[PDB]
Symmetry: D3
Subunit: 151 residues, 6 copies
């Protein structure tokens, strides 16, 4: 498939509350690209601390959401849509590079992740791309993550 | 103003985390109507329990977000954008009627509140309308509130 | 089928969890007819952080929710008795809410008593109406229709 | 000096806030002698996520903490009456806890009643003792010595 | 030495009431040395207190209890997740509690408990909580180990 | 040393996004050594991951940025809570980050940051995060202080 909803995400990604930062996948090309998004609302606990009277979605959490998008792409490219294989996998950050934040992200924003596979070798996936709001680039990132069997 | 952001909503409504359920106001016509919305994301605490493995935005919180939008409309109709007067006012919701839920609301939805003034007599404000996702009606409700002093 | 049920039993019947399980105990239950339950109100609830600062008021919409959950417990047990194995495959959906009145604010230290009677029921669809009470006084009234559905 | 206090008044005297304000209402207060207060216990508390999964039990040490807070309220108001301005400059710090006994588990749906009495007081040092009760049954006992300290 | 993953398999306590992060020492029937890290990033500090974070004294005691229970359990049955699920460690009494120094974010809260006495399933433990070599609290505790249902 | 009370007077971050507990070394316009304790009793571990607590790599980086922020604030205006209270901090860039060892409950997460470059409100720092003398992460970042 090309479109996946929160139920599908919960079945593939190991991340849970308050660290599951992808809400919906709009397009997916195996081994190539993913487009997904997270809705940004005031009703998130991060906003209590970042910052009082000035809610700004943390830049590092944008990068995290981009990584989880790459991780969803990584897993399904490897095993397809298989929750039973998925439930015992974990995802580790290995590197982060060339990230630039251009526009602050705030409550009411639809934070759209666009990742493209730059290089992959087995469990090691290197993706790069942008986060977008209303068609504009708010962030750029390059990252490398590893899929690993939980032990 | 016509469009109000979270910064402005925080200065008018007393509601705070985890009970502020309006993120942005896109349309406002004094004494007539409001269009506002709240983004729905999995990263909300309510989804821990409603329900495990099946995230569905509570219907009662849709109604609550509709009430908050009605309240913002009422207050701004009376005083406009006035944070100082906002601190001295309470909007007490007295009744809720004719509410119907047609489509469930889930993480990834942009929950749009459409409310209009149905009746305004003195301190009493009667408002009603719909919640919409992607142009479709997901809920409807009528609500009555009283303006009072804090 | 007993008349009194405690949190451990409610937990095995209702699909609701923290922070949306708003019934603590069932005191009276009549299959297909009526239920009396309650939820204790304490300052130590996260909801009071934003409703409101320096003025804790239990949200009216959450009173309606608690009445629905009471109704749902009546619905499940009426249909299947105390059966955690069947209950576990189900969720509850709100269909309608009507005739709600908020008469008295609910605050920390209140014992929120839910009184619901069955107005109509057929299969999975249940219509209930009643009041929320604190120290024998009506704090709110509501009518609502809910449906029990497979979680698929 | 009143004998009944609600959450609004407790907030003005105690510095404790969420998730560590564990007294909801004061029912009796006699200066220098005693206090009867309570906290409602509900499933809708974060503490129950971890204590314990599938079996909600109110932590015994939190019962003690609530007894201490009731004791601290009694101590302060005995000396200054209901004085929010001065309360804001003072803090009750507990030095010792003794003879704690847990008799009955406290669960969601319980009204946890604190009964504290003054065993000894001289100036800022207050020694109190008593019980936590549910339905007139002693669920815990404790003795503690407190210190009315400067906040700065 | 036991790490968080081991602790989680023995104790039924979960967030926000698991208050032991690591066990550095354990001598069966004798003593335990364990610790909990204190960080500002804990929900307790929102209310205890605003503008002045202080780790609650009762939670220091809870951490000592949890340490004492871990000692008593592993003394009898060792590292056994299967049996752990069949047992309950409930605390009957606490006594001789003294708070000496306030515990704040940045502290490594170290629990030192010894077995004072035990007979059957009743275990009396006691000791101190320590930060950087100083006693911040002390307590005696009595537990009963029972069958879980 | 600067304690949490002092950290709160300078940094605008609050719970659950204040990820520095203590400042052990400060040298204006040069370097900072700080740390955060890692405990199981943090909300993030509920989702990262269930049954396997691992402190998020991105939050290691955030903790380093906040450490570098504290260095920036004080190098600019000294210990001045009055000025600090009007400001917030924006991430501008992140580069050359590598994670070596997972960070778990029980770890003392120590941040070492030196200034690479600064001009006005814009500060570029870089360094490492360490647990028990071992480098668990490297990073470079640029932040902006704003009214
Ligand atoms: O919706 C509102 C609301 O509920 C309350 C409120 C405040 C205190 C109470 O005790 C109470 O019952 C209600 O105040 C408001 C004030 C506004 O300026 C706008 C609102 O929309 C509300
Ligand atoms: O840990 C537990 C515990 O402390 C108590 C408890 C609490 C207060 C008391 O006064 C008491 O006698 C027992 O019950 C339990 C019941 C279980 O099924 C499992 C437990 O782990 C506990
Ligand atoms: Cl940021
Ligand atoms: Cl619903
Ligand atoms: Cl309300
Ligand atoms: Cl306990
Ligand atoms: Cl304390
Ligand atoms: Cl990571």
């Amino acid at each position: 498939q090309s479109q996946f909803f929160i139920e599908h995400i919960l079945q593939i990604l190991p991340h849970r509350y308050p660290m599951l930062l992808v809400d919906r996948i709009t397009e997916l090309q195996a081994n190539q690209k993913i487009v997904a998004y997270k809705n940004i609302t005031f009703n998130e606990d991060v906003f209590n601390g970042h910052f009082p009277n000035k809610p700004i979605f943390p830049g590092v959490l944008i990068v995290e959401g981009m990584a989880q998008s790459g991780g969803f792409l990584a897993f399904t490219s490897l095993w397809g849509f298989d929750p039973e294989i998925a439930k015992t996998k974990i995802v580790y950050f290995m590197t982060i590079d060339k990230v630039k934040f251009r526009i602050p992200v705030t409550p009411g924003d639809r934070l759209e992740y666009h990742l493209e596979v730059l290089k992959h070798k087995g469990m090691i996936w290197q993706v790069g791309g942008t986060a977008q709001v209303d068609g504009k680039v708010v962030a750029e990132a390059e990252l490398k993550a590893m899929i690993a069997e939980r032990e």
